[PDB]
Design a protein around this ligand. Structure first.
Ligand code: CL
Ligand code: CL
Ligand code: CL
Ligand code: NA
Ligand code: NA
Ligand code: NA
Lengths: 516, 516, 516
């Protein structure tokens, strides 16, 4: 297999008339199909159920964007049977063949970019560029993992020779596993978590997040058209913990790939450590569990650049990112200049229906709104509210960009992942204290430093204990291939997505010697 | 750092007078040193305790090889504090510096080879060549990991460039962890499990197996002489579960490296999945948990070659190997010729005090003897006893080479790891059935095939589901570098020792971007 | 550090309205700041002096373009102390960190391109594209040396292993040195000569040429903003030989990097060979000392292409280039056709104030004008004046494109570097004689051949003894990375700028063995 060197899919900015026209057409097509029903996908076919799940438009929650089938334990078991049956032959496909299948899926997804973007807009409340970045990243995962998988092809392991013998070490896939995907990047991360394991010969049962079932189904339309053999990829939308719990605890689930809340991640990791009755392996569980990410700014920084980066990082997709800047740590010299600029920029941000391409759409659901508002109430007792902190008018879950100042480093709003448009500003004496405050959370996902001082930057490179660190730029939007993505501490297991190392997680090694 | 290409340390056969002279002197000096007391090693110093542990000679258990201090929770806590304190600076040593320290330790161990071999002979009942192979493998781990660690040095990660930015991904060590080592390779595997993590910047608290505490202390003498900084490696001999449980469950233990029984491995993996109160990471646990390893022989094999390899694999170090051939699976045409040859060879094996360099020494302890004898009783009601099946006369824990035949594949003696000189022979119709029977256990560590038929060998290459597979040779004695060692299924987490991939297990990745 | 593969900075052609608008705005900003005073830069701070230096506009020499401080011996000593103090820690920065610092400086310079170009226009009389090429090359040196330095990182040397030992060879920087920079490329070469040594851990005291002190100061503004630690780079504008002589002869100057006249280069090289009282090393001196560069044209050439290349090479930046075509060597068959075309093109060239983007601006100074006019008088006695040879009207130092024909190969104007718009045309019998005449000067910097005859080209490749040879194109404008730049013979020490080899000149090697 020889293809062009990997490049990232360009993120559409919609600065041309053609791009804007194309988006409007896609938004129209998608909403004309709001009445659509999407079944489960099990063993190469769409399989419907009696019960259904409804997906709402968070910008207008009285509007249904689609319905899906609803998997229970029986359908989970059917999918598991199909996945193991498929594994028996899928594991033996030449890598070149599996990689070509991924490349086909990427081509198909690229051809449907605007459609998927418009679905993100209506289903999960992404503005236009957030939607485009999401789909572009999905394409990137497919393109990148297709290529990366070839690096592991038979026989890939470097061994020391021995006289009179062939010694051959090589990788083999694990088996059938479960993917539990997030609602915040329900094309990108949904896709990456499935296609990584699948690329190297595993099979996957995927549970989309409840809030993003329609767009997950559309991704499955792509997998189906690409022609993954029956059972290799399976789609099980479901309500609550039933489907996920059943699979995570199953003796015949080989691995679990999870991205979501720490609460759920902790339960999954604990369950994975147990031997279910009749289980014949040690389960692998990969969990990516969010962050409490800070941007540090010191007095040497470009304060305008810092303010812009902070606003993008804090409020892009309404702060609903594992990488979102939820803490702003300012040294004394930087405090007033940076805070004033942050407030000025943030107060100018628009909030409204996502299809209108506002700076912020709504938060994703009534439950998310409740959680964010509850944290805003907690914050009023811990820090000083200086901007936003309110629900905005309309049935859509519009919350204003929110800033708290004078926040104690150990306050709940300075420690707990709010996953909404809520920034906590912490004043510190100097850069050393800035690093101390940055490090003192249970998390370790993203972090940023705005500074011109080389010694501060290089010190942070060593000592700011986060998996993805960025200097003099936004701390969100990690690009596949460029910035291996994954954290430390309670941000999860450091499974670095969009990196060569990711695929190794879904392989085991065999060493075979022949004495002639 | 530039050194000679890795080569395996030659295993001494003691066929020259020089080698015999050197070994006799080493054995005499070790024997003359019986009763020596060895303290704990914590924070760069030897630390004694009021309570003590006794290590017996299994060939003559009235004889005390030595005693050691005995760690409890307080000493475990002291070691953990020392290990984290050391980690703060050890993690920042240039890799070349850490690797040179390992190379020094290897040089010191090589200079003490005969002494360490002699200590294994007396303390764990290895004959002379088994002792030499053990020490040689320890030296190999040090030499190999010293070089392998350099492959991970700053900044090692291949990433995709991005305009206007430096993107730099690199590995960092995890922290302080615990090593729980086995009695059966208490120089080799004890050393490997410690020095691998340490090479790349971790710190380690090591608990030797109770039956092998003296030789563990001697390895620590080498570490101390080599000059590992205080706290980098710590030695905590202990009785029963206390030290191990306290460390495995501790919120501040970062990783656990375990080799031993499945029963204990299962508890460790489950405990590692839990978040202890105040814990701020997802623990990594690496477990290697034994096997129920088979050699298949078909009617095309060299039956004499097969019989010799089976006898070596089954009875080397009294069958007390995770890799030991405990099942012999014979196709119908191979059954009579191979079994007759195996019985003829096995009945000639000598058994006696390890110092006499017999074919078999004693099993390691009174408890091990009890277990093996218990399994022999079980075997008598499951298969047909055709050789051995008894304790021999004498105070030492001597058990005769034992063979059961016409053993049902699902018999306890065909499924459960006995870890003694007990071979179960299973008669099958053809090679297809041989593979079925071979695969149908909870384990997947080592396996072998004796066959001249290319199609059978290549079939097994794909379908015999074990991590370490050998054709037309013994299935024991995996060499560092040559044969990455580790299994599938309930043989553990497939942490391949003596391979480049091993060190990756003790590192996390950081990705740092600077936008200029 | 992973950045995009090196590419050369595009040279602006000003063919768009936006580019022209941008230049006009930059010219306005620069002239509004003609009243500015620029201090020395020593130990991380701007340090003023009582006395000052004035910089004039060579297109209007009654107009001051800026003033600077004026360093004497005391300030040179202060800078040397600061440079050695800085060296003690700068030498120990990881290469990745030093390279990132360079990349930052390049980014800052790129953002200030038009400003620096406009300063070159007003201060040294470059037209628009000459100014853009100069700044672009400066950026190229920073980008290229940042990357090239990583090729030398610890431990870079390939050595033969020896049993029982680590053998590690690696590079270390030399110390503090002095850079003596030219006026003709006072952004590009000024920058390259400083940042090359600095990249690999040296520290530098830089003396700008008197005619280009303002633009040197602006380059130092960039270094300051980039955040080079105090003492790493120092800026010492000065009048006459005082500062340069003091530093070149100093026992504590480790290396000297010089570009300029042969007269001065010869003195520097001789001084560098001496042991100053108390000196504890052998000084390294790198000198690049100009040329007497010829273009050969034979009768097989594209005469129109040749004429254009000759005019560009002879008269670009008024012939004030070490690489300038100052000799045109024509075989008999090429003589009339090429000369006629050269005269026709040259007579159409505009000469005037540099800001108007004429083909030629003024020569750089009253002293340069005097020298060029004096050579024109010498030429009238040696060859036949056929074009130009006159000062043009206005206070600016405008000299007409000048051509002498029938010039004897050993004439002063055919041997001595005029460094002005003066071309000497020499008629020869054939290509062999063309090469003989081309080679018979004390110099060996650039050379060109216009010919379609493969045998002539490949013969010149071997036998035309110049460091930078060009076929069927101009002989000026060597690009960083593409064309390592530096000559033979009295053109200097062959320190190839914009090449991997350049950085080796500023390093020494250490070999460290450890016997284990
Ligand atoms: Cl870190
Ligand atoms: Cl397998
Ligand atoms: Cl030459
Ligand atoms: Na929705
Ligand atoms: Na013992
Ligand atoms: Na000037």
């Amino acid at each position: 297999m020889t293809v062009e060197p990997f490049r990232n899919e360009p993120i559409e900015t919609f600065q041309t008339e053609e791009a804007r026209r194309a988006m409007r057409e896609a938004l129209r097509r998608v909403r004309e199909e709001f009445g659509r029903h999407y079944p489960l996908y099990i063993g190469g076919e769409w399989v419907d159920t009696k019960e259904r799940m409804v997906s709402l438009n968070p910008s207008a929650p009285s509007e249904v964007v689609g319905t899906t089938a609803k998997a229970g334990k029986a359908e989970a078991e059917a999918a598991l049977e199909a996945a193991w049956k498929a594994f028996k032959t899928w594991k033996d496909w030449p890598q070149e063949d599996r990689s070509r299948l991924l490349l086909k899926a990427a081509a198909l997804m690229r051809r449907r970019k605007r459609e998927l973007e418009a679905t993100l807009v209506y289903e999960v409340g992404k503005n236009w560029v957030e939607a485009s970045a999401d789909v572009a990243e999905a394409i990137d995962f497919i393109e990148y993992y297709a290529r990366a998988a070839l690096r592991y092809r038979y026989p890939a392991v470097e061994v020391v020779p021995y006289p009179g013998e062939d010694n051959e070490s090589f990788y083999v896939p694990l088996g059938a596993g479960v993917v539990i995907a997030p609602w915040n990047f329900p094309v990108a991360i949904f896709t990456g978590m499935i296609v990584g394991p699948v690329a190297v010969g595993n099979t996957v049962i995927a549970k989309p997040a409840e809030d993003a079932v329609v767009v997950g189904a559309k991704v499955f339309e792509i997998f189906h058209e690409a022609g993954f053999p029956p059972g290799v990829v399976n789609f099980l939308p479901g309500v609550g913990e039933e489907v996920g719990a059943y699979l995570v605890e199953h003796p015949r689930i080989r691995f679990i790939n999870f991205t979501g809340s720490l609460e759920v991640g902790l339960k999954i990791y604990e369950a994975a450590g147990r031997l279910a009755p009749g289980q014949t392996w040690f389960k692998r569980a990969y969990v990516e569990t969010g962050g409490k990410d800070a941007i540090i700014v010191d007095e040497t920084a470009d304060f305008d650049l810092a303010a812009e980066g902070v606003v993008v990082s804090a409020y892009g997709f309404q702060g609903q990112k594992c990488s979102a800047a939820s803490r702003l740590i300012l040294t004394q010299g930087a405090y007033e200049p940076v805070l004033e600029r942050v407030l000025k920029r943030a107060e100018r941000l628009s909030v409204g229906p996502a299809e209108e391409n506002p700076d912020l759409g709504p938060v994703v659901s009534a439950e998310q709104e409740r959680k964010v508002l509850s944290y805003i109430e907690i914050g009023k007792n811990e820090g000083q509210l200086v901007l936003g902190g309110k629900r905005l008018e309309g049935e859509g879950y519009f919350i204003a960009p929110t800033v708290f100042t004078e926040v104690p480093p150990k306050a709940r709003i300075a420690q707990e992942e709010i996953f909404g448009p809520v920034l906590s500003v912490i004043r510190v004496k100097d850069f050393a204290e800035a690093l101390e405050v940055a490090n003192d959370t249970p998390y370790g996902l993203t972090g940023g430093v705005y500074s011109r001082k080389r010694e501060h930057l290089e010190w942070a490179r060593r000592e700011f204990h986060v998996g993805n660190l960025y200097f003099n730029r936004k701390i969100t939007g990690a690009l596949v291939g460029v910035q291996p993505f994954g954290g430390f501490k309670l941000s999860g297991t450091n499974a670095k997505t969009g990196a060569l190392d990711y695929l190794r997680l879904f392989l085991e090694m065999k060493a075979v010697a022949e004495r002639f």
